[PDB]
Amino acid sequence: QECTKFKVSSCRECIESGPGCTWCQKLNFTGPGDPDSIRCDTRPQLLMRGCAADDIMDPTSLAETQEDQKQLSPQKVTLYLRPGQAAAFNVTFRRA
Amino acid sequence: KLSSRVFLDHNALPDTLKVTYDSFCSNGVTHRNQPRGDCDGVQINVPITFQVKVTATECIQEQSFVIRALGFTDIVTVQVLPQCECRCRDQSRSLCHGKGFLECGICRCDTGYIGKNCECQTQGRSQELEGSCRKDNNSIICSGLGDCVCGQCLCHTSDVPGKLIYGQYCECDTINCERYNGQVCGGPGRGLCFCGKCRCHPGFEGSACQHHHH
Ligand SMILES: CC(=O)N[C@@H]1[C@@H](O)[C@H](O)[C@@H](CO)O[C@@H]1O
């Protein structure tokens, strides 16, 4: 999709770079000469480079309905926000 | 009462958070990606839907904001949390040389330690000198006779008696000098071999210490 990694040295720094970045956590993936930033790439790049699906870290934004009175629903929502990736949720208005 | 205006807004947000609204109103009327929700004319018990999209431009900390419709007491409280940390199986206890721990398949080094396995300690500037593991820009590493350890050549050991590989680029040794009478530099009674030049003891002269002072 799209991933730029300047000074990426950790999985967190990778996820922070942009929403198209993912991180290969498999020890096997890297050799002596490679920089740590090679673990940080788009999903397709890492996949055809030999990273397994179950070792690719790729945390996503999501909306979580926590508690759900009258006109505005829900009353509470929790959002987990990965930088550059929108979380979306719906609010229903109602009256009499 | 019939509610002829439902404006959905939020309270003041930091620079790092942005919110937009789609309004799916009951009029066959939809608005997309606006800074507030806006529907004109809601009928009795006829629901309308706003889609709220929230984006952070960086990792924020736990905080909350509220969304409300103007003129009504109800409120949506939106708790916001970061989604930046990875969820990795890691081991506590090699191969960061005690100067670090693993985390998502790489070493995380302690204060004053760098390198993939936390094998180097920090200097004033250390890894910048790795061009100083090459004798010149277009030469191989440590003359093919050493490894770059922390931007400095560590020369290969040798089994050959009397031989040491040394120098900034492992470019020298103590056995490849001109011979005389079987031995290097005329043997230890005449001179000593250093980086291809014989260093003759007081009394002897010549490229391999073959002669006496005359
Ligand atoms: C994922 C989500 O909740 N989004 C919904 C969308 O699926 C639906 O089309 C609409 C109802 O008309 O409300 C939001 O836009």
UniProtKB/Swiss-Prot annotation, chain B:
The chain holds residues 362 to 574 of 769 of the full protein. This is Integrin beta-2. One of its GO terms (cellular component) is tertiary granule membrane. Glycans are attached at residue 137. Residues 88-119, 120-171, 172-210 form the I-EGF domain. GO terms for molecular function: amyloid-beta binding; cell adhesion molecule binding; complement component C3b binding; heat shock protein binding; ICAM-3 receptor activity; integrin binding; metal ion binding; protein kinase binding. The VWFA domain (or beta I domain) contains three cation-binding sites: the ligand-associated metal ion-binding site (LIMBS or SyMBS), the metal ion-dependent adhesion site (MIDAS), and the adjacent MIDAS site (ADMIDAS). This domain is also part of the ligand-binding site. Heterodimer of an alpha and a beta subunit. The ITGB2 beta subunit associates with the ITGAL, ITGAM, ITGAX or ITGAD alpha subunits. Found in a complex with CD177 and ITGAM/CD11b. Interacts with FGR. Interacts with COPS5 and RANBP9. Interacts with FLNA (via filamin repeats 4, 9, 12, 17, 19, 21, and 23). Interacts with THBD. The keyword Magnesium applies. Belongs to the integrin beta chain family. Its main location: membrane.
